[PDB]
Amino acid sequence: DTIFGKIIRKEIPAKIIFEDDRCLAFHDISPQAPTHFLVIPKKHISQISVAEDDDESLLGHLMIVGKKCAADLGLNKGYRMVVNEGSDGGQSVYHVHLHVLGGRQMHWPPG
Amino acid sequence: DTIFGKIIRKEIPAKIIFEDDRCLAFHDISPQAPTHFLVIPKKHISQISVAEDDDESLLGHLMIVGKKCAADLGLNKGYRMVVNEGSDGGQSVYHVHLHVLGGRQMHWPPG
Ligand SMILES: Nc1ncnc2c1ncn2[C@@H]1O[C@H](COP(=O)(O)O)[C@@H](O)[C@H]1O
Ligand SMILES: Nc1ncnc2c1ncn2[C@@H]1O[C@H](COP(=O)(O)O)[C@@H](O)[C@H]1O
Numbered sequence: 428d429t430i431f432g433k434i435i436r437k438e439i440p441a442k443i444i445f446e447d448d449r450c451l452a453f454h455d456i457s458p459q460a461p462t463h464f465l466v467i468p469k470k471h472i473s474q475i476s477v478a479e480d481d482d483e484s485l486l487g488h489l490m491i492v493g494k495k496c497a498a499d500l501g502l503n504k505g506y507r508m509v510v511n512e513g514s515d516g517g518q519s520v521y522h523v524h525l526h527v528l529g530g531r532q533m534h535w536p537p538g
Numbered sequence: 539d540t541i542f543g544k545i546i547r548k549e550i551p552a553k554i555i556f557e558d559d560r561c562l563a564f565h566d567i568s569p570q571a572p573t574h575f576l577v578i579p580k581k582h583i584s585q586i587s588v589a590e591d592d593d594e595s596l597l598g599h600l601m602i603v604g605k606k607c608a609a610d611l612g613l614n615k616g617y618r619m620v621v622n623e624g625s626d627g628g629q630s631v632y633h634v635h636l637h638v639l640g641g642r643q644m645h646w647p648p649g
Contacts, residue, residue, distance in 0.1 A: 459647035475605055475619070483598030490597045490621070494586055497623075505624020508586070509648045510601070512608075513616020517644050528648070533628050536570035537620045537637070538645040 431467050431522040445496050449488060452496050461530030462500050466493045472523040475512050486523075493527040502529035507537065542578050542633040556607050560599060563607050572641030573611050577604045583634040586623050597634075604638040613640035618648065 433439035434453065441453040444464065455463040466489045472478050478486060490508060497506050506529030511518040517538070544550035545564065552564040555575065566574040577600045583589050589597060601619060608617050617640030622629040628649070 475601060476609070476616075478602065478605065480602055483602050484595045485598065486601045487594030487596065487598030490586060491589065491591055491594050494589065498587070502626070505587075505622075505626035505629060507623065507627040507649065508619075508621040510619040511616075511644075511648075512618065515613070515616035515640050515643055516618040517646055517648075518616060526648070529626050532626055533622075534649040535628055536649065537622075537628075537639070538618065538648040 428471070429522040430520050431524060432471060435467070435469055445492060445499075447492070449485060450492055452492060455526065460528040460533070462497075462502055462506070463526065463528045464493075464496060464500070465524050465526055466490075466496065467522065467524040473521040474518060475510055475523050478523065489525040493525055497527055497529060500529075502527075505529060507533040509537065539582070540633040541631050542635060543582060546578070546580055556603060556610075558603070560596060561603055563603060566637065571639040571644070573608075573613055573617070574637065574639045575604075575607060575611070576635050576637055577601075577607065578633065578635040584632040585629060586621055586634050589634065600636040604636055608638055608640060611640075613638075616640060618644040620648065 445452040452466045509526040556563040620637040
């Protein structure tokens with residue numbers, strides 16, 4: 428499985444900051460902002476380009492959970508959510524997940 | 539209302555590339571990649587930090603629609619999805635929406 432499949436299975440280390448029946452979140456190992464964490468679904472979907480219609484609620488859930496965690500972490504000034512798809516998107520781990528970055532002014536373009 | 543509220547109402551111009559009962563998509567007026575479009579929900583939510591639990595499916599829908607449009611537009615090499623929240627996130631239009639950027643290698647950090 429992937430790195431995230433292993434974190435879910437408690438095979439690869441990660442301090443978990445949120446978890447429910449459908450997802451969990453943890454800090455990015457290479458933070459690009461003072462606060463930089465990921466929200467990953469327990470269900471395995473290799474990439475968003477292959478997600479099904481029926482996964483919409485799960486995908487929206489990752490955003491609602493990212494919003495909640497951002498609040499818990501004190502990101503009252505805003506943040507940026509990001510989903511990296513495929514080679515051009517810069518995807519490294521083929522298990523769908525969402526990035527949330529804050530604690531500093533995010534720039535434009537977004538990469 | 540906002541710029542996007544007006545586009546929905548057909549008050550501000552935009553070539554619409556996709557539309558269903560719950561959202562529509564159109565190209566960004568200041569493209570940061572060869573393909574750069576937005577997916578916006580017809581329902582008004584000023585920012586994702588104020589979205590409710592009950593909006594998860596709508597939020598996931600924006601991603602599924604972004605995936606479909608990306609395929610329609612030929613982004614077979616991947617892309618990046620982005621949601622700008624608040625001042626630090628770089629948010630300009632206070633009507634929740636999703637960016638989809640492709641057609642070139644996206645860099646890291648994502649701003
Ligand atoms: N063991 C790990 N724990 C936490 N974050 C990680 C770990 N391995 C990879 N990452 C992060 O996960 C992301 C994978 O890239 P992407 O698929 O583009 O989101 C990069 O931002 C890596 O820093
Ligand atoms: N009239 C318009 N038509 C299309 N895109 C627009 C228009 N007005 C603003 N935008 C884009 O919408 C985005 C608003 O910023 P943000 O809230 O950070 O996504 C920027 O990328 C602008 O280029």
